[PDB]
């Protein structure tokens, strides 16, 4: 029981971490593809 409980705790922590890392990796990939276009502002007026 002690060994299985330790494995259960370890597995849940790893699963949470892996899921969060996967989501953040997807978010970073989405952010990277985004490109900043030309700014249409009165640059001289400054």
């Amino acid at each position: 029981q002690q060994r299985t409980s330790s494995l259960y705790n370890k597995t849940r922590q790893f699963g949470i971490t892996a899921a969060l890392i996967e989501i953040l990796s997807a978010m970073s990939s989405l952010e990277g593809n985004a490109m900043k276009g030309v700014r249409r502002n009165k640059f001289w007026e400054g």
């Binding site: 899921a19 996967e22 989501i23 997807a26 978010m27 989405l30």
Partner: protein, 487 residues
Amino acid sequence: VADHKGRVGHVSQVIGAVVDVHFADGVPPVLTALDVVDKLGRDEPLTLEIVQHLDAHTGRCIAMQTTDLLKLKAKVVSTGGNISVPVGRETLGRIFNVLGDAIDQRGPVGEKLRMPIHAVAPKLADQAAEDAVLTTGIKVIDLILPYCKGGKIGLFGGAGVGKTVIIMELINNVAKGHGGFSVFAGVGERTREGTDLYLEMMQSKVIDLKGESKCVLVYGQMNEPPGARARVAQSALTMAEYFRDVEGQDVLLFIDNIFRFTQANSEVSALLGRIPAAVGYQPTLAEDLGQLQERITSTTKGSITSVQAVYVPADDITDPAPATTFSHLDATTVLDRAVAESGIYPAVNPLECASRIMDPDVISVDHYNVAQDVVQMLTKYRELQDIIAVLGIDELSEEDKLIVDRARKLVKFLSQPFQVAEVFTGMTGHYVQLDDTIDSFSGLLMGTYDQVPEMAFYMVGGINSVLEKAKKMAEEAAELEKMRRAR
């Protein structure tokens, strides 16, 4: 910008199955169908559906066919509205696709009206209360989780547990004699299964080519791109809604598999610039499924008896997609792989199924009492199995041995040979009447058949079949004894 019919646009981006179109006069409304008029040397026409507006001029769309040979700046012309699908009795006996084009090579179809595949679900005031038991001819379903006419049913299960076979049995038992019409929607499943279903329906005269048919088939399968698998269900549901409202008929709606709709949406979500949710489904998993489910309902005009097969990835019933579908059903049938591996078919787990009409007010008092007693006995047997594993059957009390014997007979008596699985089993199927099931289980619970051999309840029909099998077992055992006696 009211009438956008014929509005011209140009393809601005192509990444996988998602295409961006730029309109100089303004992007048409979302969910609008577009046709790629440019001649790109393609063997099939290309049609896009607007799903999002990036700005006042650009719109992100999803293609219904493969985007091969698609160039940038390709001319695109709006169709003036959403995707339309033919409706009416002229569609009976035919096979359609997501776009509503006949694919059975059986000549043109005479369509008098077409309806968009996207529609608003019925409101609260358009809800009808229909509490009537639906006899499927299956002992487990009729007893533990009876189905209700005009309600929603779900067949949750993994891969290879028997979801398709149960659907075929339900068709054979309910659709051949159904007063109204039927609509089968194949979503992201094997094409050979569709061919088998079509052949079976033609043999069973449900689809009478020379006469009058009473069912419609709409197929979007695995080979199709994700765009078609996310709208074939909408097309089939639109046909069912027309039959419900305009014809005022009672229609059956078989969907297999409803999980593929969610899977297709998740596949396309990544390219639409949406951050994945937990597990990796699209963030709009709940609302997308809810909008479709609310359309599958019985209103004051007609009734739809919907049977949906739900796929549970890797038998993980806690997965978000299976978990989100439970609240959208009136009767859930949960299949278990462990039951199937033990030779029990259908592999229904009665301790995980539920029915809304499992109330004394809707069903008879005897039916409710028998079902509750069966469930309680099965739960007690499951509890006692652990003690048996540790101590042993010999260590249990006589009060517990009787429960164990009765529970084993109940477990084997829930199995039934289907008329559609004769090749799998090699024996003729049975159709058990509702009253026969109740009487047989009531007798078994109180010990009227304590002396019957346990195996006499395995893969049989009513109680008469049990007695006949017991007699056959006794005869063969006597023959074996005689053979031993001579030796």
